[PDB]
């Protein structure tokens, strides 16, 4: 078997992580008690995310981490709270106060070893571990600081495995603390070096989707998390169901990442919204549209290095192939010519939910617009050394901020270099 160890850290990481498990548990016919009550053959690759326990129960191979019990107490009480392994809940009492330094260096360093003990236990019970997937935000303190700390420690212990993350980028439109650009820049510096593939889930894009198009005056985190779970379900489809394209984390990485640092994907989904709601050519045009991207970037402002499209539900494969060829050729300028056949397509018979949907995973050079936005916000504060005392007070030095800013600016210039190639 090819197992994935899932880790969720912090408020955001645990909230989106809990939704991801509710969504895929439904898709795989697993109820909150861990028992199977589905049809088809769900179950063929259930071991990728689920352990088999006594009494034919399927237990999510998930590790729940946080420096505050609050969000953890919410999970364990909500739906699918009793599905998780109680031993895998690892929490502290003194939170992180939305401070990266606290999560990465002080508060988090005190809790990290006990998390690694659970990671190790879950790994030792793997026939063949493919790697890990971490759900977290980059704007807070636990998911951002302690999450990147966990990634670093796991990589040291498992350097030959794939490290995948679903990283929620911060936005002023959906913010809680002014120091989010500091936390995000510091985390991106870590992700650039220690992850093989990152799904950039932008809160700015999720907000604009809920507000413009969806027409939600005041979107809540629940409204944003609906988009995330629909995306997370989609981008993980090839890993959970029998398929040929990107069947595992390594094959996905080999197809999606041409350059080690340029591993930040721009997800897409179609059609937009469920949360109480109601053709192949229509699915294709939407999933490629800027308005359906989960990262606030205009793909027409850059070029696609690689793309992975996934269609779900019963539909004409001939029509899918025609439509995918039509989006390319009509927009051939937005796909790098030096990477032949860089758009791959997969189709899954089992739909999410909906009768038929589409999910887009793209490695576009336009992703630099996300890193530019953060870099601009980081510089506006760092220039005036605003709130630095909260980070320097934890042991950090200003030089560390200058290095993270510089590494992210280098990342942007690298994405621009390949856009001009």
């Amino acid at each position: 078997m090819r197992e994935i160890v899932h880790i969720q850290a912090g408020q955001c990481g645990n909230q989106i992580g809990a939704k991801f498990w509710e969504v895929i548990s439904d898709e795989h016919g697993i109820d909150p008690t861990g028992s199977y009550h589905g049809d088809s053959d769900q179950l063929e690759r259930i071991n990728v995310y689920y352990n088999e326990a006594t009494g034919n129960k399927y237990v999510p191979r998930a590790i729940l981490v946080d420096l505050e019990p609050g969000t953890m107490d919410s999970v364990r009480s909500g739906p699918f709270g009793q599905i998780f392994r109680p031993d895998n809940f690892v929490f502290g009492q003194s939170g992180a106060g939305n401070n990266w330094a606290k999560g990465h260096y002080t508060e988090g360093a005190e809790l990290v070893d006990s998390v690694l003990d659970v990671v190790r236990k879950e790994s030792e019970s793997c026939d063949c571990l493919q790697g890990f997937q971490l759900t977290h935000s980059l704007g807070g303190g636990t998911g951002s600081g302690m999450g990147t700390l966990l990634i670093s420690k796991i990589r040291e212990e498992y350097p030959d495995r794939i490290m995948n993350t679903f990283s929620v980028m911060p936005s002023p439109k959906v913010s809680d603390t002014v120091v989010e650009p500091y936390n995000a820049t510091l985390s991106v510096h870590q992700l650039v070096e220690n992850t093989d593939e990152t799904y950039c889930i932008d809160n700015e894009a999720l907000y604009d989707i809920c507000f413009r198009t969806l027409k939600l005056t005041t979107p809540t985190y629940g409204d944003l998390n609906h988009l995330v779970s629909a995306t997370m379900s989609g981008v993980t489809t090839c890993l959970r169901f029998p398929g040929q394209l990107n069947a595992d984390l390594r094959k996905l990485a080999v197809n999606m990442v041409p350059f080690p640092r340029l591993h930040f994907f721009m997800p897409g989904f179609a059609p937009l919204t469920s949360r109480g709601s109601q053709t192949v050519p229509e699915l294709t045009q939407q999933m490629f549209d800027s308005k359906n991207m989960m990262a606030a970037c205009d793909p027409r402002h850059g070029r696609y290095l690689t793309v992975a499209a996934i269609f779900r539900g019963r539909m004409s494969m001939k029509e899918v192939d025609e439509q995918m060829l039509n989006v390319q050729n009509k927009n051939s300028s937005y796909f790098v010519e030096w990477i032949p056949n860089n758009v791959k397509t997969a189709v899954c018979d089992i739909p999410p939910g909906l009768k038929m949907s589409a999910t887009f995973i793209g490695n576009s050079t336009a992703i630099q617009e996300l890193f530019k936005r953060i870099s601009e916000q980081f510089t506006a504060m760092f220039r005036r050394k605003a709130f630095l005392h909260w980070y320097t007070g934890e042991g950090m030095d200003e030089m560390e901020f200058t290095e993270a800013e510089s590494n992210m600016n280098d990342l942007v210039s690298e994405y621009q270099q390949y856009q001009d190639a």
Binding site: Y105, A109, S152, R155, E156, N194, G393, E394, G395
Partner: protein, 70 residues
């Protein structure tokens, strides 16, 4: 002519055996040099990660110094 008949068959043996010999040595050299390269890539990766831990210990210590001189 018998002399040449023996030189032909011995030449064929010497060439096939020498080909089998070279291929064996080049394959073992490739698998060995590959092992060295892959292990070096992992060693440098871990060295970078270790330098990061040494820096975290130095940050925790740098806080310990500021708290006492407060």
């Amino acid at each position: 002519k018998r002399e040449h008949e023996r030189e032909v068959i011995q030449k064929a043996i010497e060439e096939n055996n020498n080909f089998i010999k070279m291929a064996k040595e080049k394959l073992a050299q490739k698998m060995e040099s590959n092992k060295e390269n892959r292990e070096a890539h992992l060693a440098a990766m871990l060295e970078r990660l270790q330098e990061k831990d040494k820096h975290a210990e130095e940050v925790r210590k740098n806080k310990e110094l500021k708290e006492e001189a407060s």
